[PDB]
């Protein structure tokens, strides 16, 4: 078969081309924040750079679903945008917060071992703080969450303001549905989001 | 080439059959190029300098094709040392360059941007950049 077919391998856009390549997506992303229009190539770098790190700390050795690709970035880069959109107006603070979001739903939600998890988050902020240090240090200050049940847009939400209210809306389910009278933990919050 | 290790197992034929396809696109190219410029047809003197060069150009993506990432530049510069005719130094792995269709000269793939706001990272929209703009001449063949 292979003797009609050409072959034309196929690898990840080097370092330096994904700067250029999703670097650009940003610059032009960062048009909706003219005030954060001055941090549009830091972006860039801070989310090149920790795709970068993790696709190596986690190879598919340690796991199989541990692949990466150019394609988280996009996930990233269109994750920035539509959380953007919604906002009347945003701030560097509330970039790097809502960055550092859509890097954990992407490159730690697949993570299992505590021990990885655990790194990746410390490894968030090193990359976050290293591009970033005019940051307020505490927008990357954890539990990171976000939901829409409660806030006008996509507003920040704490454990309280989140688990006092799903636990009420919760409430409706148990009649409706399933009696299932479910313990809203920690855990549970990162997965209903 | 063959000594060369490949993702997908060397056969004699399937390296040629791609080398001899962009080999053939290199030729077309100038057989189309003439159905434009009627009064300006090709040239036996440029012409021989862009036959000449392509040759080149589609040895290391038909018989290199197949090749790792790292792999690829190594063989294209082999191709250079050899190549008796005008060729740029191992400086610059020739992989990086390309072959003007008018000059016929080794002009770095390197020279050849702007995305919409509301489509940033999306399906359609493709950033052009090298590998991009090389790999397109390549599938065209």
């Known amino acids: 078969f292979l003797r009609h077919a050409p072959i034309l391998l196929v690898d990840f856009p080097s370092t330096s081309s994904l700067t250029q390549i999703y670097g650009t997506f940003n610059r032009a992303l960062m048009k909706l924040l003219p005030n954060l229009r001055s941090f549009a190539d830091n972006l860039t770098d801070a989310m090149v750079e920790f795709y970068s790190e993790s696709q190596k700390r986690f190879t598919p050795d340690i796991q199989a679903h541990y692949i990466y690709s150019p394609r988280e970035l996009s996930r990233w880069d269109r994750a920035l945008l539509e959380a953007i959109q919604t906002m009347d107006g945003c701030t560097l603070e509330g970039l790097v917060r809502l960055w550092a979001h859509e890097a954990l739903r992407l490159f730690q939600d697949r993570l299992v071992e505590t021990e990885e998890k655990e790194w990746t988050d410390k490894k968030i902020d090193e990359v976050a703080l290293k591009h970033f240090p005019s940051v307020n240090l505490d927008a990357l200050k954890r539990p990171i969450l976000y939901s829409n049940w409660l806030t006008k847009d996509y507003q920040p939400v704490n454990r309280s303001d989140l688990r006092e209210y799903v636990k009420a809306r919760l409430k409706v389910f148990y009649e409706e549905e399933l009696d299932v009278p479910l313990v809203l933990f920690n855990e549970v919050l990162d997965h209903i989001l | ?141």
């Open chain 2, 1 to 141: 080439a063959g000594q060369r290790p490949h993702i997908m197992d060397f056969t004699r034929l399937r390296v040629l059959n791609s080398f001899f396809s962009l080999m053939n696109r290199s030729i077309v190219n100038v057989i189309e190029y003439n159905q434009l410029h009627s009064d300006f047809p090709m040239s036996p003197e440029n012409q021989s300098n862009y036959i000449t060069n392509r040759l080149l150009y589609s040895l290391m993506w038909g018989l290199g094709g197949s090749m790792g990432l790292v792999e690829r530049e190594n063989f294209s510069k082999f191709i250079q040392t050899i190549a008796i005719t005008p060729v740029p130094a191992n400086t610059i792995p020739l992989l990086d360059y390309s072959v003007s269709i008018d000059d016929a000269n080794w002009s770095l793939w390197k020279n050849k941007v702007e995305v919409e706001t509301h489509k940033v990272a999306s399906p359609d929209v493709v950033i052009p950049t090298v590998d991009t703009t090389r790999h397109v001449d390549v599938l065209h063949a």
